[PDB]
Design a protein around this ligand. Structure first.
Ligand SMILES: [Ca+2]
Ligand SMILES: [Cu+2]
Length: 639
């Protein structure tokens, strides 16, 4: 099922109002503690008024509210389930502001939840915008509101969490659809479970940042349960999703048509492998013993043009194996892969040993030295993160993780790896003094300004358990070689969580759980709004606008000219992201060297090396002197 982040507020002195209520199904039947009694909107002789329907609670005194729950009817009647919905909070009961949570609940009779950042409130309003299957009515057997033990105002300057997006699935895998700006998410054959899958089915959900709409789809056309996969956006602008619950399958998500297309089977059956897009737009993958068997799974490569997978048996997985106590099942998982120059793939970890993978002929692998610093050799860091925040300079920030996949203490270890040419051993140093909080199963994104946002995880890796959670995110700022704590959130984001950078410059962070009838499923996501979007008073800052681009599709080495509505100081390209199981091999950042044409006209060149400027979709951000980024302009980079 799921759970609230708080404890239930006693209701015996509550006053409640509903937009309509049938006799015998009064508004207060939803708070009488009786699972068999329910509130129901008008029907029959009273007519059948359609949604939106509304439930409003006066709790009389201020509570530190951090969620609510809805228990549906328990008599088998399915016609009043709440679909699309919004949650509002108020101190006076007249002014409600923006929803603290909104989204869509799955169509079944299970208890639904809305979890969100703690906010003092006396009044709580639930708006049922649709019934789950489009019927006129709304009903609730029991509604509860939850409180945190305390409330602390966010500190000025450290960003902001909210709102919550409520979802019909646990989003354990996600990607940005670059042509539409929507967030694509998926779970498995079920909304919150992967166990005992017959295969051939993936449940997906999407969220549109522009409209707030949550939608969902059942994908069977690719005959692929895409839980636990490799994910890469290839040079043809299609997301290549590999293996997992159906360990040999390849599915292709096409953003332009918003559809899924069958791909060729991989040569080797895999799950929990990483895949990485290459300089030529192809996709490399290696490892992945979670599914398809436990044995040495060497490299293979996908060609989007020929629609083939070809084995690269001499791209050996052995040199990148961790020393996981559980053995090969875990040790070849979630490699920190980055496409690089001349068809190569850099493997930065999680193993202590770093390696170069090559894709010519039948493949090759060469040692790149050990991840290390003057503090010593870095231990295996399974489910640590790796982020290429300056591709032009070859800079990769690595952090967190634990020596074993589970039942292992995470660390604060963090490094800067500086890539040169394939086959050379990169310089590695420690990043600052490491993380503030040791964490594994955390997630991260590079931001327009080159800083890396790091969020969630737990101190000791225990899949499906929300213990030792880390609620305070951190940002690494490369120019200062310093980490900074940001404002904390209140929802655990550990195993099976994701983060992605949105085109509007905010961070989408969600998921966690996906373990069936476990209590740790998180059917939601939250927005983190970084400090660079706020002015000194804590209000949203005015953002520079890109008013014209000379072109939206460019070959590597090509130039783009832009106009802005105000002077800008910096610009960057950020490749669109994909995410699952801590892995995001698609994001990376290119800082741009600007030519000032005068009159707020600027030009820049896309790097000529497609191992740096990986083909695919990128976000163009410009920043003003105050450090405020524009929203992204979408650029396609080709080779
Ligand atoms: Ca009841
Ligand atoms: Cu998993």
């Amino acid at each position: 099922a799921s759970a609230p982040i708080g404890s239930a507020i006693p209701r015996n002195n509550w006053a409640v109002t509903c937009d309509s209520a049938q006799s015998g199904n009064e508004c207060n039947k939803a708070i009488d503690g009786n699972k068999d009694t329910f509130w129901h909107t008008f029907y029959g002789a009273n007519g059948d008024p359609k949604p939106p329907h509304t439930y409003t609670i006066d709790m009389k005194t201020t509570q530190n509210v951090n969620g609510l729950s809805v228990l549906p009817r328990q008599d088998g009647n399915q016609n009043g389930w709440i679909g699309r919905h919004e949650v509002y909070l108020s101190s006076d009961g007249t002014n409600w502001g923006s929803p603290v949570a909104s989204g869509s609940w799955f169509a079944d009779s299970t208890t639904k939840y809305s979890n969100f950042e703690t906010r003092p409130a006396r009044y709580v309003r639930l708006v049922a915008i649709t019934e789950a299957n489009g019927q006129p009515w709304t009903s609730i057997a029991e509604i509860n509101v939850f409180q945190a033990s305390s409330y602390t105002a966010p500190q000025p300057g450290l960003g902001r969490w909210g709102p919550t997006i409520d979802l019909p699935i646990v989003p354990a895998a996600a990607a940005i659809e670059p042509t539409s700006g929507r967030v694509l998410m998926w779970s498995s054959y079920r909304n919150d479970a992967f166990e005992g899958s017959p295969g051939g089915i993936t449940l997906t959900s999407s969220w549109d940042p522009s409209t707030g709409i949550v939608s969902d789809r059942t994908v069977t056309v690719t005959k692929h349960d895409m839980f636990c996969p490799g994910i890469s956006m290839d040079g043809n602008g299609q997301i290549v999703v590999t293996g997992g619950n159906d360990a040999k399958k390849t599915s292709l998500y096409d953003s332009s048509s918003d559809s899924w297309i069958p791909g060729p089977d991989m040569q080797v059956a895999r799950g929990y492998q990483s895949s990485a897009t290459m300089s030529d737009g192809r996709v490399f993958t290696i490892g992945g013993s979670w599914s398809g068997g436990v044995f040495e799974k060497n490299g293979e490569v996908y060609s989007p043009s020929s629609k083939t997978w070809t084995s690269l048996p001499n791209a050996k997985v052995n040199p990148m194996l961790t020393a996981d106590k559980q053995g090969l099942y875990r040790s070849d998982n979630h490699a920190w892969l980055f496409g690089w120059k001349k068809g190569s793939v850099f493997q930065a970890g999680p193993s202590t040993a770093m390696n170069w993978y090559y894709t010519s002929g039948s493949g090759d692998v060469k040692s790149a030295g050990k991840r290390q610093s003057n503090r010593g050799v870095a231990p295996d860091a399974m489910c640590g993160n790796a982020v290429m925040y300056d591709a032009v300079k070859g800079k990769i920030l690595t952090f967190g993780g634990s020596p074993d996949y589970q039942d292992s203490d995470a660390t604060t270890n963090a490094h800067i790896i500086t890539l040169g040419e394939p086959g050379t051993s990169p310089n590695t140093v420690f990043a600052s003094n490491g993380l503030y909080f040791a964490r594994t199963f955390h997630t991260s994104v590079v931001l327009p300004d080159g800083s890396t946002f790091i969020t969630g995880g737990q101190r000791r890796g225990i899949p499906f358990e929300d213990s030792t959670p880390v609620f305070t995110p951190e940002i690494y700022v490369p120019e200062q070689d310093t980490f900074y704590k940001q404002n904390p959130n209140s929802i655990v984001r550990a195993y099976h969580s994701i983060s992605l950078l949105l085109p509007d410059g905010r961070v989408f962070n969600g998921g966690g759980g996906l373990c069936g009838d476990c209590t740790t499923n998180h059917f939601d996501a939250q927005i983190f709004t970084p400090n660079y979007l706020y002015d000194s008073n804590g209000n949203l800052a005015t953002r520079p606008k890109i008013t014209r681009t000379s072109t939206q599709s460019v070959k590597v080495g090509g130039r783009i000219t832009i106009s802005t509505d105000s002077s800008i100081s910096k610009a960057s390209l950020i490749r669109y992201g994909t995410a699952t199981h801590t892995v995001n091999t698609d994001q990376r950042r290119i800082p741009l060297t600007l030519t000032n044409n005068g009159g707020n006209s600027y030009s820049f060149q896309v790097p000529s090396d497609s191992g740096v400027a990986l083909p695919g979709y990128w976000m163009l951000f410009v920043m003003n002197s105050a450090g405020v980024p524009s929203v992204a302009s979408t650029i396609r980079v080709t080779q």
